[PDB]
């Protein structure tokens, strides 16, 4: 009944788009924020493949029914390829054209990542959207280093395509995304996009960003990089990001987002609100009887005041960071919905202006 | 078959004791460290703990009861101890209305309101299916004037009697669980003696030393334990709430403590601190980026058989939450290994030597 992977765009404004990705396990409304999944509202959740590879192991995840039964989640699941850990854990890796081997453990165990093995692991995880095994080029990088890195990733992208297509069950029920690299350099971005389009992918991710370059540099790279990708295919900005990062990226053609800030902020005493992020540990909140956000519809905001959460956190009650995290996750979905609504109305440019004016005034 | 609650002392050295607490759900080897339980062997604990105040608010004591109590909630058939809320009475006092009846918390944005009292606290701990129940007390804030410490301790002692009666009013709880009284009095010796006498007049299966590990410092805490622990019944377990660092545990055992709890193993593991026999290490230090050794060369835990300092250092630097999970899993296991070496050394008559050796190696910091 449902298609394997059908991306439809229902409304546009400037470079921004809103629409749906239809898959066998459900519909993904775009622009989308995709939260990190955990072991047992968003349309799709994510699995940290490298993490699951080590704990409890991809084969064990497979034997217990894949990530859908592992996370109690019957809707789509996207998995990364490991290309980010290829960089972020590079000091523990031996890297070559064949792939990436990690340092042997104290028990003899050894893990390796390659275009073939990464697609095999993501298949074992039962993921619905598979990412090519790439390398997230570190920042900053010389044009020479960015070029060799991107070019290797593109050869890895072709191997990921073949490895995905070599498995009948995976090729007929999942989808494959290519990942554009090239650091901040326009000619290399164009090379990667062309190389990805020559191979063919269901969706196209903009990789190698949100690695310390700053929002101004990131927006500048998206300005020329997103229009290099196929316009009739989803655009996924990996690792992004702050709410204002999300809004500006949507302005530049991104349909899919992921990042760990909702949980990382909630564990560090930071809550996202329509008036900007607040540091709940600040003394101004010690007697603030308002919820974290006066408009938020999440469960936390219907029950918990800033004062209560501020004292929970000051008192060492871990429940306080859990409520902050639960609010931040829900706030992110509320942001994406308002984005989708405003594009559908033809008022996205006005929403982005109003969002920024209120988010940066910080009248919390 | 098994008794409700039987504490046996198998060996002693100075004020230190090792032995067993026997309960219907299993044996607790003492001195014991009791880790925080969550929702579902040399590193294994005999009893785990429930944050009653947390569970009261999420998901609720009644809901925990309907799903089979904390034993099925945490997938744990061995004993479970629950706190009473007396610490949150202090730590969240700015959100409370306190009176002789009990402690009422600030109403929520949904109309909901939570209150704690000696009667309701024992009722909640019963609903949680707890095996060891703590009296509803008040952990007196530090510092405190002698006047404030006195009114606080005396209120807690009246609450302790109400906790006893409320515990005894429920036949199933009274026949299958155990009740601990909590000594207060801040750092003041005369008040500690009043609290002990008052608790022993009432009668409890075990006696906790409350109101410590609240910022007084190890030197002050040891000074209070010097006179406070011998005020308690010698043939009953002694539980030091909130303690603590490994060197706090060793010194407390030297002064007669049989039971410990604290969140430092998880709090340290989430902040990049691992406990080792050479003292704590900050895994984030660059010295560990290529350190091929495990966190600790002697540790028998699962992490130390597989994971090097170098790998965990880079996991944490790379933002991989798995790094903090391994640090945490090692810290929890090291804690049980410390308690075992403590129990072994008392049984051998060598605890005083172990304590000297432990401190010499732990503080030299030759990691
Ligand atoms: C922060 N800036 C950021 N993160 C990039 C991730 C990783 C995304 C990944 O980020 C965490 O893993 C580490 C998340 O795990 C907690 C994953 O969610 C499960 C998430 O995978 C979708 C990239 N992944 C690949 N394969 N390639 C990239 O170029 C790339 C760029 C990123 N920038
Ligand atoms: C840090 N110094 C510390 N913690 C004291 C706790 C609470 C222990 C409690 O500490 C966390 O709750 C807050 C733990 O939850 C995460 C509880 O374990 C589940 C644990 O309950 C046994 C005390 N509790 C009572 N009832 N009375 C006390 O006098 C007392 C003294 C403490 N000192
Ligand atoms: Zn909220
Ligand atoms: Zn270990």
UniProtKB/Swiss-Prot annotation, chain A:
Listed EC numbers: 2.4.2.29
Pathway annotation: tRNA modification; tRNA-queuosine biosynthesis
Gene Ontology terms, MF aspect: metal ion binding; tRNA-guanosine(34) queuine transglycosylase activity
Record: residues binding substrate: 80-84, 134, 181, 208
InterPro entries: ArchSynthase1/Queuine_TRR, TGT, TGT-like_sf, tRNA_ribo_trans-like
Pfam families referenced in this protein's UniProt entry, alphabetically: TGT
GO CC annotation terms, alphabetical: cytosol
Residues that coordinate or bind Zn(2+): 296, 298, 301, 327
Taxonomic superkingdom: Bacteria
Flavoprotein is among the record's keywords: no
Region annotation RNA binding: where it falls in the sequence: 239-245, 263-267
Catalytic residues of the enzyme: 80 (proton acceptor), 258 (nucleophile)
Family: Belongs to the queuine tRNA-ribosyltransferase family.
Protein name (record): Queuine tRNA-ribosyltransferase
Lineage of the organism: Bacteria, Pseudomonadati, Pseudomonadota, Alphaproteobacteria, Sphingomonadales
